[PDB]
Design a protein around this ligand. Sequence first.
Ligand SMILES: *CCC(=O)Nc1cccc(-c2nc(NCCc3ccccc3)c3ccc(N)cc3n2)c1
Length: 328
Amino acid sequence: RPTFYRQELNKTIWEVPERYQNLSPVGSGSVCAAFDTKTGLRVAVKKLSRPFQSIIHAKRTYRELRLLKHMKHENVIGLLDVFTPARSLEEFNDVYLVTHLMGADLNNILTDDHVQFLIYQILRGLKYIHSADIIHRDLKPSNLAVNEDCELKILDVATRWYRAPEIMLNWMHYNQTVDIWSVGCIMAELLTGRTLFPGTDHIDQLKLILRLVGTPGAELLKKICSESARNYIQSLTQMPKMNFANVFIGANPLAVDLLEKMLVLDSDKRITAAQALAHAYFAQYHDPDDEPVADPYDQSFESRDLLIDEWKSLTYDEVISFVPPPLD
Ligand SMILES: *CCC(=O)Nc1cccc(-c2nc(NCCc3ccccc3)c3ccc(N)cc3n2)c1
Protein backbone atom coordinates (compact mmCIF):
# COMPACT_ATOMS: atom_id res chain seq x y z
CA ARG A 1 0.00 0.00 0.00
CA PRO A 2 1.77 3.13 -1.14
CA THR A 3 1.88 6.47 0.53
CA PHE A 4 -0.38 8.99 -1.06
CA TYR A 5 -0.32 12.72 -0.97
CA ARG A 6 -2.99 15.29 -1.58
CA GLN A 7 -2.93 18.17 -3.98
CA GLU A 8 -5.57 20.50 -5.40
CA LEU A 9 -5.49 20.91 -9.15
CA ASN A 10 -7.90 23.04 -11.25
CA LYS A 11 -10.50 23.07 -8.50
CA THR A 12 -10.18 19.30 -7.73
CA ILE A 13 -8.31 17.37 -4.95
CA TRP A 14 -5.93 14.80 -6.45
CA GLU A 15 -4.81 12.15 -3.99
CA VAL A 16 -2.08 10.04 -5.72
CA PRO A 17 0.86 7.84 -4.69
CA GLU A 18 4.24 9.51 -4.19
CA ARG A 19 5.53 7.45 -7.06
CA TYR A 20 3.78 10.05 -9.25
CA GLN A 21 5.38 13.52 -9.06
CA ASN A 22 5.04 16.92 -10.75
CA LEU A 23 1.37 16.58 -11.58
CA SER A 24 0.46 19.03 -14.26
CA PRO A 25 -2.91 19.32 -15.94
CA VAL A 26 -3.56 18.55 -19.62
CA GLY A 27 -7.36 18.93 -20.19
CA SER A 28 -10.68 17.12 -19.87
CA GLY A 29 -12.80 13.04 -16.02
CA SER A 30 -9.68 15.26 -16.09
CA VAL A 31 -6.08 14.35 -16.76
CA CYS A 32 -2.66 15.23 -15.43
CA ALA A 33 0.77 14.76 -16.84
CA ALA A 34 3.12 13.31 -14.19
CA PHE A 35 6.63 11.96 -13.74
CA ASP A 36 6.60 8.41 -12.61
CA THR A 37 9.54 7.55 -10.44
CA LYS A 38 9.19 3.80 -10.44
CA THR A 39 9.70 3.77 -14.24
CA GLY A 40 11.20 7.02 -15.46
CA LEU A 41 8.21 7.75 -17.70
CA ARG A 42 6.05 10.75 -18.31
CA VAL A 43 2.53 9.35 -17.75
CA ALA A 44 -1.07 10.58 -17.90
CA VAL A 45 -3.03 10.14 -14.69
CA LYS A 46 -6.76 10.35 -15.34
CA LYS A 47 -9.12 11.03 -12.37
CA LEU A 48 -12.54 9.75 -13.25
CA SER A 49 -15.40 12.20 -12.92
CA ARG A 50 -18.18 10.79 -10.59
CA PRO A 51 -17.45 7.22 -11.49
CA PHE A 52 -20.46 5.72 -9.57
CA GLN A 53 -23.01 8.49 -10.01
CA SER A 54 -25.63 6.32 -11.70
CA ILE A 55 -25.91 2.73 -12.94
CA ILE A 56 -24.70 4.04 -16.28
CA HIS A 57 -21.69 5.95 -14.97
CA ALA A 58 -20.84 2.84 -12.86
CA LYS A 59 -21.08 0.41 -15.69
CA ARG A 60 -19.13 2.74 -17.89
CA THR A 61 -16.38 3.01 -15.30
CA TYR A 62 -16.27 -0.76 -15.04
CA ARG A 63 -16.22 -1.10 -18.83
CA GLU A 64 -13.34 1.35 -19.28
CA LEU A 65 -11.24 -0.30 -16.61
CA ARG A 66 -11.91 -3.82 -18.07
CA LEU A 67 -10.96 -2.64 -21.57
CA LEU A 68 -7.79 -0.86 -20.47
CA LYS A 69 -6.67 -3.87 -18.43
CA HIS A 70 -7.11 -6.00 -21.45
CA MET A 71 -5.26 -4.01 -24.08
CA LYS A 72 -1.62 -5.20 -24.47
CA HIS A 73 -0.42 -3.96 -27.79
CA GLU A 74 1.90 -1.43 -29.17
CA ASN A 75 -0.74 0.49 -31.06
CA VAL A 76 -3.42 0.48 -28.37
CA ILE A 77 -3.34 2.46 -25.12
CA GLY A 78 -3.07 0.11 -22.16
CA LEU A 79 -2.89 0.51 -18.38
CA LEU A 80 0.36 1.34 -16.52
CA ASP A 81 -1.51 1.51 -13.20
CA VAL A 82 -4.87 1.97 -11.57
CA PHE A 83 -5.43 3.16 -8.05
CA THR A 84 -7.79 4.59 -5.52
CA PRO A 85 -6.88 6.50 -2.36
CA ALA A 86 -9.65 4.35 -0.62
CA ARG A 87 -8.49 1.92 2.08
CA SER A 88 -11.63 -0.32 1.63
CA LEU A 89 -14.70 -0.99 -0.53
CA GLU A 90 -16.96 1.03 1.77
CA GLU A 91 -15.00 4.24 1.23
CA PHE A 92 -14.35 3.51 -2.50
CA ASN A 93 -15.35 6.51 -4.50
CA ASP A 94 -12.50 7.65 -6.75
CA VAL A 95 -10.68 5.97 -9.60
CA TYR A 96 -7.41 7.01 -11.16
CA LEU A 97 -6.03 5.47 -14.36
CA VAL A 98 -2.39 5.75 -15.43
CA THR A 99 -1.36 5.38 -19.01
CA HIS A 100 1.55 6.41 -21.24
CA LEU A 101 1.54 10.15 -21.94
CA MET A 102 1.54 10.63 -25.70
CA GLY A 103 2.84 13.79 -27.34
CA ALA A 104 0.00 14.84 -29.55
CA ASP A 105 -2.97 13.50 -31.51
CA LEU A 106 -3.78 13.23 -35.16
CA ASN A 107 -6.10 16.17 -34.93
CA ASN A 108 -2.83 18.23 -34.72
CA ILE A 109 -0.90 16.48 -37.43
CA LEU A 110 1.22 14.94 -44.74
CA THR A 111 3.24 12.96 -47.17
CA ASP A 112 2.03 9.68 -48.68
CA ASP A 113 4.85 7.91 -46.76
CA HIS A 114 3.84 9.50 -43.49
CA VAL A 115 0.23 8.45 -44.14
CA GLN A 116 1.30 4.83 -44.88
CA PHE A 117 2.92 4.50 -41.55
CA LEU A 118 0.14 6.04 -39.42
CA ILE A 119 -2.73 4.26 -41.16
CA TYR A 120 -0.73 0.95 -40.97
CA GLN A 121 -0.37 1.46 -37.27
CA ILE A 122 -4.12 2.16 -36.74
CA LEU A 123 -4.96 -0.99 -38.74
CA ARG A 124 -2.52 -3.06 -36.73
CA GLY A 125 -4.13 -1.94 -33.42
CA LEU A 126 -7.56 -2.44 -34.86
CA LYS A 127 -6.66 -5.99 -35.90
CA TYR A 128 -5.82 -6.62 -32.32
CA ILE A 129 -8.91 -4.90 -30.89
CA HIS A 130 -11.25 -6.62 -33.40
CA SER A 131 -9.76 -9.98 -32.57
CA ALA A 132 -11.11 -9.59 -29.03
CA ASP A 133 -14.64 -8.99 -30.43
CA ILE A 134 -14.38 -5.36 -29.45
CA ILE A 135 -15.60 -2.53 -31.66
CA HIS A 136 -14.06 0.85 -31.00
CA ARG A 137 -16.96 2.81 -32.53
CA ASP A 138 -15.55 6.26 -32.07
CA LEU A 139 -12.40 6.47 -34.11
CA LYS A 140 -11.49 10.01 -35.07
CA PRO A 141 -8.24 12.01 -35.23
CA SER A 142 -8.51 13.09 -31.56
CA ASN A 143 -8.62 9.39 -30.41
CA LEU A 144 -5.39 8.58 -32.11
CA ALA A 145 -2.29 9.65 -30.22
CA VAL A 146 1.24 9.97 -31.75
CA ASN A 147 4.61 10.56 -30.10
CA GLU A 148 7.57 12.45 -31.72
CA ASP A 149 8.84 9.05 -33.03
CA CYS A 150 5.64 8.83 -35.08
CA GLU A 151 4.47 5.84 -33.02
CA LEU A 152 0.66 5.72 -32.90
CA LYS A 153 -1.71 4.44 -30.18
CA ILE A 154 -5.44 4.10 -30.31
CA LEU A 155 -7.38 5.33 -27.26
CA ASP A 156 -10.97 6.15 -26.16
CA VAL A 157 -13.74 17.63 -34.40
CA ALA A 158 -17.27 16.08 -34.81
CA THR A 159 -17.63 12.31 -34.18
CA ARG A 160 -20.26 12.36 -36.91
CA TRP A 161 -17.69 13.18 -39.59
CA TYR A 162 -15.98 9.77 -39.14
CA ARG A 163 -19.08 7.56 -38.44
CA ALA A 164 -20.17 4.70 -40.66
CA PRO A 165 -23.47 5.41 -42.37
CA GLU A 166 -25.06 2.26 -40.74
CA ILE A 167 -24.50 3.89 -37.33
CA MET A 168 -25.94 7.20 -38.46
CA LEU A 169 -29.05 5.18 -39.33
CA ASN A 170 -29.18 3.27 -36.05
CA TRP A 171 -28.71 -0.24 -37.51
CA MET A 172 -28.57 -2.59 -34.53
CA HIS A 173 -26.41 -5.18 -36.17
CA TYR A 174 -23.38 -3.22 -37.47
CA ASN A 175 -20.06 -5.07 -37.47
CA GLN A 176 -16.41 -4.34 -36.73
CA THR A 177 -15.96 -2.64 -40.10
CA VAL A 178 -17.63 0.47 -38.83
CA ASP A 179 -14.14 1.22 -37.49
CA ILE A 180 -12.73 0.60 -41.00
CA TRP A 181 -15.02 3.24 -42.35
CA SER A 182 -13.64 5.69 -39.77
CA VAL A 183 -10.08 4.85 -40.74
CA GLY A 184 -11.02 5.50 -44.37
CA CYS A 185 -12.33 8.94 -43.36
CA ILE A 186 -9.14 9.65 -41.35
CA MET A 187 -6.84 8.54 -44.10
CA ALA A 188 -8.62 10.68 -46.68
CA GLU A 189 -8.26 13.64 -44.39
CA LEU A 190 -4.50 12.96 -43.96
CA LEU A 191 -3.89 12.67 -47.70
CA THR A 192 -5.94 15.75 -48.65
CA GLY A 193 -5.82 17.94 -45.55
CA ARG A 194 -9.68 18.24 -45.62
CA THR A 195 -12.43 16.55 -43.55
CA LEU A 196 -13.85 14.08 -46.09
CA PHE A 197 -17.49 14.42 -44.90
CA PRO A 198 -17.99 17.44 -42.75
CA GLY A 199 -21.73 17.10 -42.21
CA THR A 200 -23.52 19.80 -40.22
CA ASP A 201 -25.84 17.09 -38.92
CA HIS A 202 -26.84 13.46 -39.57
CA ILE A 203 -28.91 14.22 -42.70
CA ASP A 204 -26.20 16.42 -44.17
CA GLN A 205 -23.67 13.66 -43.21
CA LEU A 206 -25.39 10.94 -45.25
CA LYS A 207 -26.01 13.44 -48.09
CA LEU A 208 -22.23 14.03 -48.29
CA ILE A 209 -21.37 10.39 -48.02
CA LEU A 210 -23.79 9.39 -50.79
CA ARG A 211 -22.39 12.06 -53.14
CA LEU A 212 -19.09 10.05 -53.13
CA VAL A 213 -20.03 6.43 -52.80
CA GLY A 214 -23.28 6.66 -54.78
CA THR A 215 -26.86 5.91 -53.93
CA PRO A 216 -27.08 2.24 -52.83
CA GLY A 217 -27.87 -0.57 -55.23
CA ALA A 218 -30.42 -3.38 -55.14
CA GLU A 219 -27.89 -5.80 -53.53
CA LEU A 220 -27.65 -3.59 -50.46
CA LEU A 221 -31.27 -2.36 -50.44
CA LYS A 222 -32.61 -5.85 -50.20
CA LYS A 223 -30.71 -6.25 -46.90
CA ILE A 224 -32.64 -3.41 -45.37
CA CYS A 225 -35.83 -4.43 -43.53
CA SER A 226 -36.96 -0.94 -42.58
CA GLU A 227 -39.17 0.87 -45.08
CA SER A 228 -38.34 4.01 -43.10
CA ALA A 229 -34.62 3.80 -43.87
CA ARG A 230 -35.35 2.20 -47.29
CA ASN A 231 -37.71 5.03 -48.23
CA TYR A 232 -34.89 7.49 -47.30
CA ILE A 233 -32.11 6.43 -49.66
CA GLN A 234 -34.65 5.75 -52.49
CA SER A 235 -35.94 9.24 -51.88
CA LEU A 236 -32.59 10.86 -51.03
CA THR A 237 -30.80 12.32 -54.15
CA GLN A 238 -30.12 9.40 -56.60
CA MET A 239 -26.38 9.87 -57.55
CA PRO A 240 -23.81 7.43 -58.95
CA LYS A 241 -20.58 6.08 -57.50
CA MET A 242 -17.82 8.72 -57.92
CA ASN A 243 -14.43 7.63 -59.20
CA PHE A 244 -12.01 7.84 -56.31
CA ALA A 245 -9.02 8.62 -58.64
CA ASN A 246 -11.06 11.67 -59.73
CA VAL A 247 -11.70 12.70 -56.12
CA PHE A 248 -8.26 12.01 -54.62
CA ILE A 249 -6.51 13.49 -57.64
CA GLY A 250 -2.75 12.89 -57.75
CA ALA A 251 -2.70 10.74 -54.61
CA ASN A 252 -0.93 7.42 -54.67
CA PRO A 253 -3.23 5.10 -56.63
CA LEU A 254 -2.70 2.31 -54.07
CA ALA A 255 -3.99 4.72 -51.41
CA VAL A 256 -7.01 5.48 -53.59
CA ASP A 257 -7.56 1.76 -54.07
CA LEU A 258 -7.51 1.07 -50.29
CA LEU A 259 -9.81 4.05 -49.85
CA GLU A 260 -12.21 2.41 -52.38
CA LYS A 261 -12.14 -0.77 -50.26
CA MET A 262 -12.75 1.00 -46.89
CA LEU A 263 -15.39 3.43 -47.96
CA VAL A 264 -17.92 0.86 -49.10
CA LEU A 265 -21.44 1.54 -48.08
CA ASP A 266 -22.24 -2.13 -47.64
CA SER A 267 -20.54 -3.21 -44.51
CA ASP A 268 -20.70 -6.84 -45.61
CA LYS A 269 -18.31 -5.94 -48.42
CA ARG A 270 -16.05 -3.50 -46.53
CA ILE A 271 -12.47 -4.63 -46.05
CA THR A 272 -11.43 -5.91 -42.60
CA ALA A 273 -8.45 -4.68 -40.59
CA ALA A 274 -6.55 -7.89 -41.20
CA GLN A 275 -7.36 -7.67 -44.92
CA ALA A 276 -6.40 -4.06 -45.20
CA LEU A 277 -3.05 -4.93 -43.59
CA ALA A 278 -2.12 -7.25 -46.45
CA HIS A 279 -3.06 -4.60 -49.01
CA ALA A 280 -0.22 -3.50 -51.32
CA TYR A 281 -0.13 0.07 -49.97
CA PHE A 282 1.44 -1.33 -46.73
CA ALA A 283 3.94 -3.45 -48.61
CA GLN A 284 6.84 -1.79 -46.84
CA TYR A 285 5.47 -2.38 -43.21
CA HIS A 286 3.20 -5.39 -43.40
CA ASP A 287 4.58 -8.39 -41.63
CA PRO A 288 2.03 -11.12 -40.75
CA ASP A 289 4.26 -12.45 -37.95
CA ASP A 290 4.28 -9.10 -36.26
CA GLU A 291 0.55 -8.40 -36.30
CA PRO A 292 -0.67 -10.11 -33.20
CA VAL A 293 -4.20 -10.86 -32.02
CA ALA A 294 -5.60 -10.45 -28.53
CA ASP A 295 -6.51 -12.83 -25.78
CA PRO A 296 -10.23 -13.38 -25.71
CA TYR A 297 -12.15 -10.83 -23.75
CA ASP A 298 -15.11 -11.60 -21.49
CA GLN A 299 -17.83 -9.18 -22.56
CA SER A 300 -20.70 -10.99 -20.71
CA PHE A 301 -20.95 -8.10 -18.25
CA GLU A 302 -22.29 -6.00 -21.12
CA SER A 303 -25.62 -7.82 -21.10
CA ARG A 304 -25.91 -7.63 -17.23
CA ASP A 305 -28.28 -5.21 -15.45
CA LEU A 306 -26.89 -4.57 -12.01
CA LEU A 307 -27.09 -2.29 -9.04
CA ILE A 308 -24.80 0.74 -8.70
CA ASP A 309 -23.15 -0.89 -5.73
CA GLU A 310 -22.54 -4.09 -7.67
CA TRP A 311 -20.88 -2.32 -10.59
CA LYS A 312 -18.92 -0.46 -8.00
CA SER A 313 -17.79 -3.58 -6.27
CA LEU A 314 -16.81 -5.24 -9.55
CA THR A 315 -14.75 -2.20 -10.36
CA TYR A 316 -13.08 -2.33 -6.94
CA ASP A 317 -12.20 -6.02 -7.58
CA GLU A 318 -10.52 -4.98 -10.86
CA VAL A 319 -8.53 -2.19 -9.18
CA ILE A 320 -7.31 -4.60 -6.48
CA SER A 321 -6.43 -7.44 -8.87
CA PHE A 322 -4.44 -5.22 -11.25
CA VAL A 323 -1.03 -6.70 -12.24
CA PRO A 324 1.21 -3.97 -13.62
CA PRO A 325 3.18 -4.65 -16.77
CA PRO A 326 6.94 -5.55 -16.48
CA LEU A 327 9.73 -2.99 -16.91
CA ASP A 328 11.47 -3.10 -20.36
C1 LIG B 1 -34.77 -4.58 -39.54
C2 LIG B 1 -34.60 -3.17 -39.08
C3 LIG B 1 -33.67 -2.54 -40.13
O1 LIG B 1 -33.66 -2.87 -41.32
N1 LIG B 1 -32.88 -1.60 -39.60
C4 LIG B 1 -31.99 -0.92 -40.31
C5 LIG B 1 -32.07 0.45 -40.20
C6 LIG B 1 -31.16 1.22 -40.90
C7 LIG B 1 -30.15 0.61 -41.65
C8 LIG B 1 -30.06 -0.76 -41.75
C9 LIG B 1 -29.00 -1.31 -42.48
N2 LIG B 1 -28.05 -0.48 -42.97
C10 LIG B 1 -26.98 -0.91 -43.62
N3 LIG B 1 -26.09 -0.07 -44.09
C11 LIG B 1 -26.50 0.77 -45.12
C12 LIG B 1 -26.45 2.08 -44.47
C13 LIG B 1 -26.87 3.08 -45.41
C14 LIG B 1 -26.60 4.41 -45.09
C15 LIG B 1 -26.93 5.50 -45.90
C16 LIG B 1 -27.57 5.27 -47.09
C17 LIG B 1 -27.86 3.95 -47.44
C18 LIG B 1 -27.53 2.87 -46.62
C19 LIG B 1 -26.77 -2.26 -43.82
C20 LIG B 1 -25.65 -2.75 -44.53
C21 LIG B 1 -25.47 -4.15 -44.73
C22 LIG B 1 -26.45 -4.98 -44.20
N4 LIG B 1 -26.35 -6.26 -44.39
C23 LIG B 1 -27.60 -4.48 -43.52
C24 LIG B 1 -27.76 -3.12 -43.31
N5 LIG B 1 -28.84 -2.62 -42.64
C25 LIG B 1 -30.97 -1.52 -41.04
